[model samples]
Target chain A: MENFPTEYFLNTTVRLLEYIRYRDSNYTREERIENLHYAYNKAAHHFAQPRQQQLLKVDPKRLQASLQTIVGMVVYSWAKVSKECMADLSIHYTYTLVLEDSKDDPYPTMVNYFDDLQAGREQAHPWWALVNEHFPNVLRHFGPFCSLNLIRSTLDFFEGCWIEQYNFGGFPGSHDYPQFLRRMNGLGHCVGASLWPKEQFNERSLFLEITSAIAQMENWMVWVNDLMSFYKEFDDERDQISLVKNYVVSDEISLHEALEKLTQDTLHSSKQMVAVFSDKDPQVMDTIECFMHGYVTWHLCDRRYRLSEIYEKVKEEKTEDAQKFCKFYEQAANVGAVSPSEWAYPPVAQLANV
Target chain B: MENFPTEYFLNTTVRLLEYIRYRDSNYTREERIENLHYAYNKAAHHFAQPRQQQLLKVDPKRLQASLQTIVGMVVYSWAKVSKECMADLSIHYTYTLVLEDSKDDPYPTMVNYFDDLQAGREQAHPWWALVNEHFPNVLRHFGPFCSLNLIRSTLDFFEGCWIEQYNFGGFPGSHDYPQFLRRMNGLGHCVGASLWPKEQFNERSLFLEITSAIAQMENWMVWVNDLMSFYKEFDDERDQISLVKNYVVSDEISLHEALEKLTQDTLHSSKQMVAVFSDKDPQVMDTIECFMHGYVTWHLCDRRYRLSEIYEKVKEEKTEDAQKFCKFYEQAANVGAVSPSEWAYPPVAQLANV
Candidate 1:
């Protein structure tokens, strides 16, 4: 826990604070700290005070990782929502993290979370009651239809990820990977749903158009994550059905080819998404652009990347595959600009064909 | 619809009336009529008055079938909710039916309904406005969380049916059919959720326990429907991935054998469902019983069955297989009681094994 540089924590928090200020300029520093405390307290309750204390003592890095993940997700997805709504969203996201952490623990199924939230009962964990308390208020403010959509999308994301972990051995074919990734990256849609005005979203075509674009943006972001974290993900003991691995196994392609294929697909999808909304809703487009840039920036700064360690280890291996992967990674990360350009434009018809 | 006997319409309407009167004793006959009108008007708007009028003129039977389907679903699923809530549920259900009818029509998608429901908008279809008008009230009556679950489950059901229609040629394996059937039968849970007290449902374990039982009961009812409508479904031009069909293809068995398997499974599941709720909540158990019995009675009495024609055709085919199917169908239909019995008992663990 203590091995990581102190700069990592400072950089992550500072960026998060800047994001808060940018999203809501009216918030005083005191209010921002209070919101942070709310999220942190909600998370701590889930860990159980004793376990949380133990984690701080024995594995502060893991504890910091979990908190940072929650903070990053909140800033990225829910910053535009009201402070109260943002708090509730943070609680829900933290619950997901807690569930993931307890996946290998006894009785770790999703039902546990639901059970804890039930009325007139003892919660399995203290945080469950707090989550339940906010459920109604969130629903009231967000509107039932929109809120329900958000909840459904969030659950689908968790379920998709859980299934991927177990089903990694059977790589989905290349054609199916996008749909899988779209669902795996479903949380972004929920975030967008929560942040966007419900009245505007009720315009079904416009809603679908925006969500479709969001899905593509989310897919693009996931591919970026796959590219940036390939080494760290591959080295982990748990098997993960990542895009690069899926491409490699399904297409019998080399690492470099897989990386190139994913990159091209991501860029192509991003252009299609931009085209869909470029003229229709500049505000949505701006938010999406913010999401993409914020995501990439967070990835570069988050200690979870272990970027230096990954680079050093791969370089030390000195294998041809490692060198090729490193070369592609660098190119993908440095791809000229995040902004859409003429070369990135694939025919919109091409999307429908898929 | 005029082609069918007056007796079919008489029987259907009488049974539906009895259901309404039984479920809500406080509602006057006039109130029930008004409620039915509201639902029917919503349906008519979606089909477009001219199209609906044309259907009544040319193929009254198709229009009758659509209306009857909505009426039946409402009586079975939403009768327990308040009349206003029931009307909203009917609108949602009818919208799904219209989409199914116009599967290949221009912009025949769920988003169209959402778009119509948005504020200050002229609906693409007249009923869209009516549906939109009732949306907020439904959300208010049904809390956001439950309402969202209802909406999510409804969409999933429609999507499941749509996918099943296209994917019918390749039957899922025997082991996979239960999960498929569970999802396909998901509407039952939404109906149950809408009717049950939200507080009771907030208890996660109890809710899952009951919904699990409902799923089993739903599976049983679906199997029963397949058994009763096998000939009709098989004769239809459009392929339907029915449970019996899945069994026949996956087990490489004769239709007669598949019939036997489905019957036994249905009976086994019914007993398991009853056992789950018999002591815990007899009211829920009674509802399950109501759902099963109601489904069977509706099938028997509904004009859509073409029951006599089916019987005559099968008798003329007069193969040993046909005779065997008739024998089992008669027993399943006349199965003396809906109540669980010793003979119907299957080990509860049997469910988990699946």
Candidate 2:
């Protein structure tokens, strides 16, 4: 694949910092941009060789799609942070995804990256230095008491994702799926938690409630992604474990049915979450809302899902099943606002005794 | 404090592995002993200077008592395991405690040690080398799926503790106290989880339940330690945070009331935990039981608490309140079995209405 456009890369990094500035006025635009540059340069340096290799293997458009989707998610989730800090976290995520996608021994590379970070090899890894510099700043900017917990939890999230990738073939069952997903979803919570000033919320229950709300937001996003990406994943014949595939295979349901089930579940969970935090913390609610809307918007438009292509294929096939599935995507893509009612299923009336 | 006896150290390490053998005969006694040797030697090398310095600062008996108390908790919690592995985990804990007790910049030293481990700087730190060598063994012995999570969580636990220490003066309130305590208690869960075979329990909920149970176990143990160590802490003029003190200050209760409240809370939390796991998983229940019982037993008898000295002081003072406090300790010490009834409050129907 051709190299990702330099403008797109630079602009994407800039957009992340812009979002941070928009959310929290504590940081200057210039400061955010500079931090982003540092973070972007570090990520580019680390992934330079691997990115070139990846270009030769995958379609350039597909690569761009993947990068855009991740960048969009990072920008939406880590709203309001220093450009450097935002860039550091986003780049780390990018590195994880890129490494996992590589044909080389990705797990070892991932392990080595974390090892370097842990070892304080700041000169070797920019992310390591960024963490040392930014993590302390976060503790100081945010209250040390809560910020430290968030930092630790963020590390747990990254480590969990790495471990999940290490055992890629071993899918956790339905019962254990949420637990794994919680760790994966931890980034949003970690970043979201840090964005809020510590003085506003000091009660442990409130913090936990906020965490629970963020976790639910992640659940819906992951589930929706699984549904949207089903066709692309099937087309590519990727063996990666996914929630939709697991449910389809385990429940003996068609892809259309699995999509319906997942959407309904996501809606239900999100509603419960919104209700949980609605009266307590509007900041948390806003963050969750921002994440859900941003994620859905990206999913609808991103080529990673091949939304338009899927619609075209279904129309050409003109089969009853194809039409039904096609309609689901069309409706999903057009669903504008990220409200429970928009995604929620209609109530079924009781059948009269016949 | 005088140096801990070699026999006591050796026997404590052996006993941990013996527990492992007794629970699961998968590992031979020789293997367990050898592992202990590796673990013990590495801990000795790292903590040698700090331990010697600690002796000059604190009473020798208090030092021994502290070491024995921790060793007892490790042995009890881990049950059966390789000596090296047990010692490695225990030594890491001991290092954190000892460094914190030092007059030097203990926090930086603690941070440096973890950094070395993360960096894979085995040549600089033997513990790092041991972790590199043995961590994978743990993953292999347990399923890679669970083992990686355990490893990551263990690191999170250690990092959390270190961060908590770094923010020494910033005490978490009562509502937020247990959340911090849970992370602090995570080492026991991480090590304890590793001891069990992978096939024994594979469900995510089970793993989490075990974690929760262990956290509760830690809560009570920490609270009891605060109660027992009050005199010693007072004597040393240590400014370290304590649960009992937090409760007293936060709740605006007298020290006597704080002591009573803590004991009741400890008993109640422990009971709830035991009930939660009683029928579902006896192994977890047993581990929790062993940890609680073993911790209390050590505290009652250890010189760190100065049980005898306190009793003598109260008798000599001959004040009504002092006599009452003394009686409480006497009863607590003689409480033989780790049963709820033994530590249960006396019937007070007359005061119940008031």
Candidate 3:
């Protein structure tokens, strides 16, 4: 086992935060929660199972946390989307997350997924079935590029999840395998594409910029997620494995070295994004900048990363700068997803009352 | 309205050629013709149209010319794909080209195209129905990223063609309309995606480079086509509107000024592509370099561009380099598609000695 302590995680997080030059989330506390409620309820409407003709139920707490994670990721990262679009993204992501954590062996289903989809047959699983039923509705909001990208990225994630189930335990032979798996699972293209709201950026006029933006977004999303998740998965002895662990084991390197590589990589990606796009369209540049800051900030604030443990020591050090950084997430984490029962029949125009 | 002579195009073509640092095509005359034959025959197999099992017949000369255009396109641009893949692309492009030049207004069919596609209904048009039948076969040859890009680009082309059927005559109020239409019609993304033969470049590992490459490809494929086609369409006072005319009419600018704008833009794009990718993956980098050179060469050599008219003046001046440049097309145009009756049951392993 490698030697690392609590202080190591804190300093590294702080360093990454400073390197990225984190910015504040665009929304206030209330706005974030309102979208979460709206997205959750909007997604919830499709729960009438086909054969059963009955609704599904879940513990409100678990469901809220799932909804909350999606909101944390997209609400800040994709700040420009209207309430309905936010809900559109959030629900799709939440259902995808549920399937990601499912114990079902998806190899057979995935192998035949596209065939069924191409033939317009019912999808293999409820998740894919749901996507089949509703993905077009979501696609209509975005242009062809984003719509296609969303499909491509989601496909990669599906394949990545399948491979991850089988490959990690024995450890794949290719040194490139781990990174390949990480990129696939990252859904970076989807995140990158989601940033360009059709209302603001037309794919045709901004083709080159959109291409660059997606590349930038892919790196930023995947690398940052891996870098932040490194701390939590550090102690997990379960089936869970991280990019840091994969590098350590796959390359016969130490965790410290792998962590350093990813940290530097994330910072480099963000810096290059700014350097390259400073002269791009004003709306596009701002969208990217806002997304970068918000995405990194989401991880810092996300309860799932278990980063509150590092906050106490920073507070004791009286670093008001770090305190301000943590405050964004702290407030965000507190403004949790509202229970399904809390909203009216239609959440629109009613989010204010809530 | 404008004052320019044949010499302007010759010098511009040569200047743009040198700026891009054009390289010789990888395939020999024999090889190029061999693949064209292969692709033509390969695609001919699909003529067993589903509803009408009766074998369809196309005028061999027209079919050969259509197939010739695609081979001229992808054979040089996508040098790495095997004979099978080259055929796959050529056939698809040929079919699309026929649709493009079709007097058939694609309006009604285009509107209901994706809906039927999503629902898996029989496509409204034969062209679409063919795509529905065979697109999956094509997608399998590429990785998830490239596959998605090809679909997206094709979708854009579909919309652009639909719009062109209506919009240009009235001249849409927005200045961005022409470029928008062009990008869609260009099928640039398809050409761009086709370059990264899955065997050489994996989407996950080379995601960033591929994104940049596709961006580069989009510009290179499109702007070059517009620039070269300007000459052919300049005289024809028909429904055909080149990007130059769009600029002229849309902004009330002179044709010369607009042409210069495009000239500068194409050169700039080519230069930037080289600058950005110089330090990247050798395989990916080289693939793009070859594609750039070959793509431009294809247009120069293509009968569609009518650049041969300028070649005579260059020959009159006795510039060996200019002479050598025209020789590529001169030779290729002569080494035309082998008559279908001339080939055997399986063209593979039999392309030799034909």
Top-TM-score candidate index: 3
Interface RMSD values for all candidates: 14.6, 9.4, 11.1
lDDT of 2 by residue, A243-289 (tens): 55545543456655655666565455444544455565676666555
Note the residue pairs that clash in candidate 3: none
Please give the fraction of native interface contacts (Cα pairs under 8 Å between A and B) kept by each candidate.
0.01, 0.10, 0.07
Q: What is every candidate's C-alpha DockQ against the true complex, given to 2 decimals?
A: 0.03, 0.08, 0.06
Off by over 4 Å in 2: A1-63, A75-92, A106-119, A122-178, A181-236, A244-269, A281-284, A306-354, B1-48, B51-70, B73-81, B93-151, B158-189, B192-354
On DockQ, the stronger of 1 and 2 is: 2
Q: What is the DockQ of candidate 2?
A: 0.08
* Whole-model lDDT per candidate: 0.46, 0.44, 0.63
- Chain A TM-score of model 1 comes to 0.60
Q: Please report, as a residue range, the 10-residue window in candidate 2 chain B with the lowest summed lDDT.
A: B342-351
Judged by DockQ cut-offs, is candidate 1 incorrect, acceptable, medium or high?
incorrect
- Specify the highest-DockQ model's number: 2
Candidate number with the higher DockQ (1 or 3) = 3
lDDT per residue for candidate 3 within B1-354, as digits (tens), equals 453456566656666777766655546667766765576667655433333222213444455466557756777667677787887887678767755665566544544444565687877666666665667766767776677567767765765565565546213222433564566589877887877767766876676566546655676678888888887787877845667787776546777887887888777766666666666788877877777776776776666777777667666566655665566445444443233344323322232213
